[PDB]
Design a protein around this ligand. Sequence first.
Ligand SMILES: CCCCCCCCCCC[C@@H](O)CC(=O)N[C@H]1[C@@H](OP(=O)(O)O)O[C@H](CO)[C@@H](O)[C@@H]1OC(=O)C[C@H](O)CCCCCCCCCCC
Ligand SMILES: [Mn+2]
Ligand SMILES: [Mn+2]
Length: 237
Amino acid sequence: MKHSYFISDLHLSETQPELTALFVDFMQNLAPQAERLYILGDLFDFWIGDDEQSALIQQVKDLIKFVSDQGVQCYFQHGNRDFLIGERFSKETGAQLLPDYQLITLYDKKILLCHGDTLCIDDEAYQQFRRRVHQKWLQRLFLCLPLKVRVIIAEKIRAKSNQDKQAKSQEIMDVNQAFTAEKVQEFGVNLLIHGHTHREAIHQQEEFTRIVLGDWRKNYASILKMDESGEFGFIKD
Ligand SMILES: CCCCCCCCCCC[C@@H](O)CC(=O)N[C@H]1[C@@H](OP(=O)(O)O)O[C@H](CO)[C@@H](O)[C@@H]1OC(=O)C[C@H](O)CCCCCCCCCCC
Ligand SMILES: [Mn+2]
Ligand SMILES: [Mn+2]
């Protein structure tokens, strides 16, 4: 039974070693038997450049490389927490980098993949911040700074973002339905998979189905599985 997995929004961090354990069990016991593994952003709590080094980072890279070298096709799509991942991280892990939208053909299904933050177009404060940090010239500037200063910048940008979110309603921090519907029509799909919005769900709209990967918490790993029988669903337990 050929099958593939979809995960996102793990936000791996030394502060939370409960998820890393869940990630190790998934990568060592289920991922090797998969045909493809897609990681749709927010694998790390934050990413400040491909020269980051730590016991947790070298662990996570190893798990991806071990799954990849066994013939599993691994893909990474950027999230908002780790959009700085580049060509070096891709070579070290085997995970091929996908653009912010990617149409795939899997098990006779046309599927649109994105992280999910580009669909929250009513969060205008976030979208303006997203346009700035995605400019290549400023990213080259940021990566020229020493490793230690970028971490504090990241920890404080994280800190501000935690404040601004409590200033926002839940509506504008979720996906705009009309825009999301237009995306699906642009790519000609009946199936859309994304993360970012934290709320694991499967919405069976009339025109299409929208699968939402949830956050990983200490007691739950959100893992979507599709197989060649055309079924899909989240690995419970
Ligand atoms: C080239 C520069 C490199 C910088 C490297 C950055 C390294 C760290 C990046 C991770 C931070 C990331 O969490 C910020 C973010 O995206 N938050 C949005 C998101 O909230 P989450 O909890 O992360 O899901 O989802 C929420 C719902 O959609 C959304 O609301 C949040 O958006 C925010 O809260 C952002 C704040 O509203 C504004 C942020 C301003 C902070 C400083 C801006 C200065 C611009 C810096 C330019 C150099
Ligand atoms: Mn996100
Ligand atoms: Mn996230």
